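Quick one: endothiapepsin from Cryphonectria parasitica, structure tokens please.
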Amino acid sequence: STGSATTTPIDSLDDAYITPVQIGTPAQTLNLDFDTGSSDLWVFSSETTASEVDGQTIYTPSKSTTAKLLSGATWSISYGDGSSSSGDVYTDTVSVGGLTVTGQAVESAKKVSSSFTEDSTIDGLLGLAFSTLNTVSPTQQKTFFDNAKASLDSPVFTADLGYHAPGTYNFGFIDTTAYTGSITYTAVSTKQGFWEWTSTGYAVGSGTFKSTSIDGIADTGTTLLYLPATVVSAYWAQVSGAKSSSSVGGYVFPCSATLPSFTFGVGSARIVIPGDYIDFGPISTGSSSCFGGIQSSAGIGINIFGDVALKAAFVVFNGATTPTLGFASK
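--- reply ---
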């Protein structure tokens, strides 16, 4: 089997991407944030504290004839950005782009943190990291991909995120028309539960490539590109007037600037992030100070190849017995 679904930016800045997901019988379609950095499929629901729901579409398990309460199961998650959610668990039928899993754990939120409430466009998350990170207790549950894998034509999914435009998540096949040149594959460590890999280096603008190993995670659920302070300083030094602002929370730059590209290495291959992908717009409405899309990972504890990086590539998440990652230009 295969599946193919369009993923759409939630706003004009590509702060996140939402993908429609069918849950239950009859289908209840929710728009979920596909997150290769976590491993829970959780939704706003009829059980979510009413004051914490503000415009989201909810899953109502009592209206699904295939929903079954997973007795005694609870979940609770905290994300890198400080947001969180928790609740109980159903199993139900879940379909993405024509690909159907029966008996998928659907984690129903009883509580969500304010950042989720305040984002009306995201109805929940669909985790695509390794199932070892799943938070369901006392019996850990499998991701949608893990459940689908054996049925797929090939045990892969691909992320093709758009810049200021829709893109595609495919399951079970590689669309050879969706990229240019070849796909370069690179080793993955699953030791921390992530799609963790080592970039071979970087360049800023038309500058020379610096060969250096950068361990980090391919994370569709993180907006920005978080890299070591040395690398980030080298980038922003090429933007006149750019500075790190402790009050704002990262590097800012004059909105009048033209940003240089940023290149990262995948083996001997190179992925070029155009400068415009690194512009996250005014820090507050009407400001002429703009927020940068490349930020320091210092104090995160890990480097993160988030959407800024991934959207410059066609990305293969190869879930073979030994997983790997592939990157192509597009």
